[model samples]
Target: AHHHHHHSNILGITSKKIENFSDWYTQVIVKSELIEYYDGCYILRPAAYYIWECVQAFFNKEIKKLNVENSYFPLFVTSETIMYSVFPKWIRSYRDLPLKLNQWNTVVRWEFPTPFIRTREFLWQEGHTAHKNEEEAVKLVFDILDLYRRWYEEYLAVPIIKGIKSEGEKFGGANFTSTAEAFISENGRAIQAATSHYLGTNFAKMFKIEFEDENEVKQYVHQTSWGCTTRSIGIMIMTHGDDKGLVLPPNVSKYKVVIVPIFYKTTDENAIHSYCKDIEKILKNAQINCVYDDRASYSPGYKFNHWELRGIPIRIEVGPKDLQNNSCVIVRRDNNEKCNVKKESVLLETQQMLVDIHKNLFLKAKKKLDDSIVQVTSFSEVMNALNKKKMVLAPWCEDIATEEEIKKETSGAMKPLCIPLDQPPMPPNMKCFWSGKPAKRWCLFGRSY
Candidate 1:
């Protein structure tokens, strides 16, 4: 349905921002050159690939510090590896408790098109682990989820809610599933940005992921799995993007600084290009993601549109006039902030600008997230909020039925998302957001991805 945005080669699309968010999103993905479609799978474009590299690099840096080794599992999991039933009983015992493994690979399912959502072949990590005791195992699951939160908050600039997926929605046979979910696009529809699961015995028994205890009794180890994906790129594109173009977090952009050479005459062009080469070397020396765009084929104005659409975090421009002055102009992508970073301190200045862009994006989006959450009390409020595409915040009966009644008409399209970790005691006299029964506690409810 949204493919129209990516299909047409027609250059000029609508300028509408949040006003026409859906069409604008469709337009941005294609327009920004973030992604392209193959026969079915979405081919990662330069813009998309750059961010993907950033994500991969970040994880590689972080996971290794914890003694987690980088390894590869096969892309195609055999029927035995992915058995659908209580097959975790098939192998292993206590000797393998706390065993851990992970991989970044592709997966496929025969089903309706997920487009960027459900790709036949998708990129992700399937982390499997076994633990010595219940406490350690539980810690492993939550700890992994916390790591995901750090990535989202620090790098991606998105705030997330973490909690267990309902029994009805738990991944097949997982004992419990934890999701890191956040908003995407102007619809404010919730999407599961990542998932970390405590598989318990289902997988351990199925795969012989077992080990022997000190007492020599064989036992299945507690297990867990978690993943982040290229689809996350799609989610980020939808979440914080504006109709003008992508609003990328600096952490994942390929080029932290893009230099556009502007000149009027041939003499000026040569001078500008020479200056860019010198600045490029300086940025490279510091290991910053930097590039100079000096293509004579397109005008300076056109280059500005291109970088903005692709979501470069910062832009540097050098003109013949600036060359004579020994100074350069810097502009932020998120906000068109203009400054002249002195020639000698361009490297330090660029680094700080990158940091500021990420901070600006996170604060603005997080504020909007807080504003968009509407607290509901009555059935009427629920109906109205869902109809308006806003996320609902309310307390429910905690029972499956009350959850279902809130969900029944929505047909699983909407439901509570999470029960936050540090929920305070309810005011003792408060009623449920739904059935008016003494509520267990306040919970987050809404339709989600």
Candidate 2:
């Protein structure tokens, strides 16, 4: 009916929909105005940034509970900062280990661009700590990794594979690196959403951060650091987004509801506007993010499609006719379900719908996970499954080296997701999926973000 001009010059949704992933993702981020590329690095658009804020709120509480205090470190680590700390790049000593600190900051890397996937600079949270010994240090690393998993799964609603990273993939200066990898985007590629590294006193020795134990002996602390970033927002956009546009999970959508007034000129805009004031009060009281789209120039259909395209989870439309009926139309973006809510309890019903939308999204994604995996007992089968562009569940030897080879062979996206320690071997009594040695572990392997 009518096209509302976007001030930022972002392309419209219809201009985006092709199946090619890179092109489609770029368009969604750009068209939705969630982010923009500047001089090779991508900057978070308001919506994406807000998701990061929501994620911070969810995880910061956990960090505090773990006795992990939020503290600030200079973003630019100086050579002196690197030198005085004598931070052993591969931490070797143990005691002052398990010393952990966290920072929410940005990093700029010099490289060619890879859209949302790779950027020159990005925003992320980094936590660094040290422990006394290998076992203790490792435990801390995995504990942090589990926290990373919760952030991705429960908050972002993206399920991840947990496992160790191969030597080649280890963080540049850490003794051991592991990751929480999530398969993301419409293409089903696996991406390393977050990573934790066991420094084994590497940075501690290098940085000379030592602690005196009960014996009063100074010892180097084994260390670990992990980070998550705004790139995750890109991952979400590409993962759940469909042809219409972005499909944000209601749990973290910036504005979960948008209220639009539907009426042609003249029959008391005043009456409809006044009625909406009460509804607005109800939503605000519930602390739900909402908006009244009473723009004079936009039609009801235009507002409907606009909210739908932006992926707001719910919309409440009111008009004189609805007033006569003592109700208004409440539409769900998750499944396009609609209903008429009585004027009195729109507040109560909106809360129910939010919960329902979240449950429905989780169930739907769980089904996708179920359908996306293929079991492989042999290397040939792994190759074929990969060619099919789906994730392969393979029986692995738990050898990181072999995993690296498989990663190189696939040319990238198809790395091993950690050996999911649960579930019996997919093929009972399986052989090694790679080397034909006895199967050491059942692992999920696939290409990623």
Model 1 poorest 10 in a row by lDDT: 1-10
Single out the weakest 10-residue window by summed lDDT for candidate 2: 78-87
Q: Tell me the tens digit of each residue's lDDT in model 1 across 182-223.
A: 875366578777888877777656666556677887776677
lDDT of 1 at 419: 64
Kindly list the per-residue Cα lDDT of model 2 for residues 7-111, writing each as its tens digit: 222334644443576666666777666777675556677887788888988778888776676777563653112322534543443433444577777666665
How many clashing residue pairs appear in each of the predictions shown?
25, 38
Model 2: how far residue 277 lies from native, Å = 2.2
Off by over 4 Å in 2: 1-11, 15-18, 75-98, 109-111, 172-175, 204-210, 215-219, 399-413, 426-429
Candidate 1: lDDT of 326? Answer: 91
Tell me the lDDT of model 1 at 52.
64
Error in Å for residue 198 of model 1? 2.0
